[PDB]
Structures are given as structure tokens and as C-alpha cells.
Design a protein around this ligand. Structure first.
Ligand SMILES: Cc1cc2nc3c(=O)[nH]c(=O)nc-3n(C[C@H](O)[C@H](O)[C@H](O)COP(=O)(O)O)c2cc1C
Ligand SMILES: [Cl-]
Length: 358
């Protein structure tokens, strides 16, 4: 047989007993027509479920104002909650642990996606410059956001709280707060975006206030052992960089310690220039640490051997390998992924048609 590897080692996380450390990263696939989870997702998630394996669902919108892309699922209506149930049930049928990633795009939207054509909301009133859409043909334009007022913010915090409850109602084992990639929560944390002059800005502490109020509200709502949060301190995605990423990341993990969460999920920096690294954050964080961003089998085992993380989340390789955990375990060849169908809308093509090991 093949030598055992750290990636296949059981891991205790929060109140859960995982059977291995290969995690399905959150992956927006834009196949949730009308913002409603679809039948084909039942198969998609089921194909990737393993006994005791952790699955993090695609970013799920917490309210009407959090929409910034077509066909992404939401979880603010009964219809969406009910549509989520069969998908969650399929994952549970195979013994998987399923966390719902709750999300709000903030300024990364257009009034055409908004209720009554309203302006997107954000920590600031500055908009994004145009971006080339996933199809590589069309250009996405964004509407300048309306700066949320100090007293409006708690209402948004409550939207995350309600979304978390709805996820529990749908049967999810827990929720992951989307505090990354320049979306609403990251907009408040990043100093290139947050130019507020009230208590939600002006200092590292103030910029992280929003994220921490969300953690508290969500943790108090469903229990901290059913809560995780994802951050990307070093990412500049959606024009959301920070002048001191290391300090930002350190402050967040140190502040998150007191909440006793199920885990903290951090994305690796794209480049190393003090220097960008997740090691200091792993050392400062006392709970379960999940890393993601460019990992393969070799790097995944190495991260565990060097004790840089407890869990390793895989995105692209999991898109093309339903049975990624098994393949890693057998050190089997991997299917290549086709980025051209990552965000296309077919129920099957590039979604459920990647083959299992022969
Ligand atoms: C098609 C696609 C969709 C993604 N959707 C999300 C998402 O909804 N939420 C999120 O936090 N990250 C999202 N990500 C980022 C991934 O979770 C992960 O961090 C990324 O794939 C980095 O790792 P990899 O080298 O294993 O692909 C997405 C990535 C891809 C390629
Ligand atoms: Cl302000």
C-alpha cells in the first residue's frame, strides 16, 4: 500500500470529529438560478462528501443588498432555506460536516442587482473601477456605494446573525463568516477602503470592529463551536489592500481567541516581499487554523509537518477531483481543472462531470 500522510489524519475541531484534513474550500460556481440553491448542487456536494470530511459551501448571500453576481445562492428567504436542505442532507448522508459561508458583497455590486435599484452599501462612498467578467468578454461596471451610517451598521450585523440562524435551520453544521477578498467585512478592515471617521474607522481596532461585532452576534446566535471566520489580510482582491497586512492579520487572530470559535480560516499571501506569512498568525491563534491558497498534496502535508496549520482547504483541485481526499490518500494522479467552466451556468458541464478515480 501507500505510506500514510498527515493530510489523512483525523482532527478534532470545535465539537466536530473530522476523519481527515483535506477541506473543500468555499467556491462560488454561479449555478444557483434566481439566487436559489438548485438540485444539481445536491449531486455536486454529495460527490465531494466523505465521512468526517469538512465541506465549506459556496459564498451564500445574507440579504437582497448582498448580491453582486448572477446565480449565486442566498439564504434570507424560506424558499432558499428549503432549497438548501436536500443539499445539506446529501452531504450528511455520507458523513460530511457542512459549514455555510455567509456573505455580503458590499460595494462589489451594481444598482441593477440591488432592491429598487438602490446603491450598493459599504463602509465608504468610493466605487470600484471596471473589471473584466469571468467570461473574458464582458466588462463589469460597479455603482458607487452609499456609505452606511453609524447607526445602520448594527442592522447589517443582524443580517449576518439571521443568515447564520437560517443556515442552522437548513441543517448546516455551522457557518463560516466571509471576512475576505474585499467583500463587505473586508471593506471595513482594509485601510485602503475604510476612510470612516466614526467608531468603525480611524484605527486598526476601529476597522476590525465590524468584523468582531459580527463574530459576536453570530457566535451568540448559534454557539461559537459552530462558527468559523475566513480572512485574507494579504489579499488586494477588489481593490481592498492594506498598508500593514501583518498587523491586521495578527490583530484579528489575537482578538478572535476570546470567542472560542470552531476555527479561523486564512488565505496565503500571493507573494512574499515583516514579510508576508501566516506563521505568526498561526502562532498567535489558539484555536483550529485552516490555510488555503495554492496548495497541492506535497505542500499540504508539509504545512502539517511544519505545524503551520491543522487543516488545509483546497479549491481548484477539488473542483476537478470529486474524490480529492481519496486521490491524495492513494497518491493517485489528479484531473486537471478547466477554469473556463468555473463560473459558467450549466447544471452538469464543468460542475458534476469531473470523473472519480477509475
Ligand atoms: C471558481 C472559484 C470560486 C471561489 N469562490 C469563493 C467563495 O465563494 N468564497 C471564498 O471565500 N473563496 C472563494 N474562492 C477562493 C477559494 O476558496 C480558495 O481560497 C482558492 O481556490 C485558493 O486555493 P486553491 O489553490 O486550492 O484553488 C473561489 C475560488 C475559485 C477558483
Ligand atoms: Cl464615517
Amino acid at each position: 500500500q501507500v505510506d500514510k500522510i498527515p493530510l489523512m489524519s483525523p482532527c478534532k475541531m470545535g465539537k466536530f470529529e473530522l476523519c481527515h484534513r483535506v477541506v473543500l474550500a468555499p467556491l462560488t460556481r454561479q449555478r444557483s438560478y434566481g439566487y436559489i440553491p438548485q438540485p444539481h448542487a445536491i449531486l455536486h456536494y454529495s460527490q465531494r462528501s466523505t465521512n468526517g470530511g469538512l465541506l465549506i459551501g459556496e459564498a451564500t448571500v445574507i440579504s437582497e443588498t448582498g448580491i453582486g453576481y448572477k446565480d449565486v445562492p442566498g439564504i434570507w428567504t424560506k424558499e432558499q432555506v428549503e432549497a438548501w436542505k436536500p443539499i445539506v442532507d446529501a452531504v450528511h448522508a455520507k458523513g460530511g460536516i457542512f459549514f455555510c459561508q455567509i456573505w455580503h458583497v458590499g460595494r462589489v455590486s451594481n444598482k441593477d442587482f440591488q432592491p429598487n435599484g438602490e446603491d450598493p452599501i459599504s463602509c465608504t462612498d468610493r466605487g470600484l473601477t471596471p473589471q473584466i467578467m469571468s467570461n473574458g468578454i464582458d466588462i463589469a461596471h460597479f455603482t458607487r456605494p452609499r456609505r452606511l451610517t453609524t447607526d445602520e451598521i448594527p442592522q447589517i450585523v443582524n443580517e449576518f446573525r439571521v443568515a447564520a440562524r437560517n443556515a442552522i435551520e437548513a441543517g448546516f453544521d455551522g457557518v463560516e463568516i466571509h471576512g475576505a477578498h474585499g467583500y463587505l467585512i473586508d471593506q471595513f478592515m482594509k485601510d485602503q477602503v475604510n476612510d470612516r471617521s466614526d467608531k468603525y474607522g480611524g484605527s486598526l481596532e476601529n476597522r476590525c470592529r465590524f468584523a468582531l461585532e459580527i463574530v459576536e452576534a453570530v457566535a451568540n446566535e448559534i454557539g461559537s463551536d459552530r462558527v468559523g471566520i475566513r480572512i485574507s489580510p494579504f489579499a488586494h482582491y477588489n481593490e481592498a489592500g492594506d498598508t500593514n497586512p501583518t498587523a491586521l492579520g495578527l490583530y484579528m487572530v489575537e482578538s478572535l481567541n476570546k470567542y472560542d470559535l470552531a476555527y479561523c480560516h486564512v488565505v496565503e499571501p500571493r507573494m512574499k516581499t515583516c514579510t508576508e506569512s501566516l506563521v505568526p498568525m498561526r502562532k498567535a491563534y489558539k484555536g483550529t487554523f485552516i490555510v488555503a491558497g495554492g496548495y497541492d498534496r506535497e505542500d499540504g502535508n508539509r504545512a502539517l509537518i511544519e505545524d503551520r496549520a491543522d487543516l488545509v482547504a483546497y479549491g481548484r483541485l477539488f473542483i476537478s477531483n470529486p474524490d480529492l481526499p481519496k486521490r491524495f490518500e492513494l497518491n493517485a494522479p489528479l484531473n486537471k481543472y478547466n477554469r473556463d467552466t468555473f463560473y459558467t451556468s450549466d447544471p452538469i458541464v464543468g460542475y458534476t462531470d469531473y470523473p472519480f478515480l477509475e
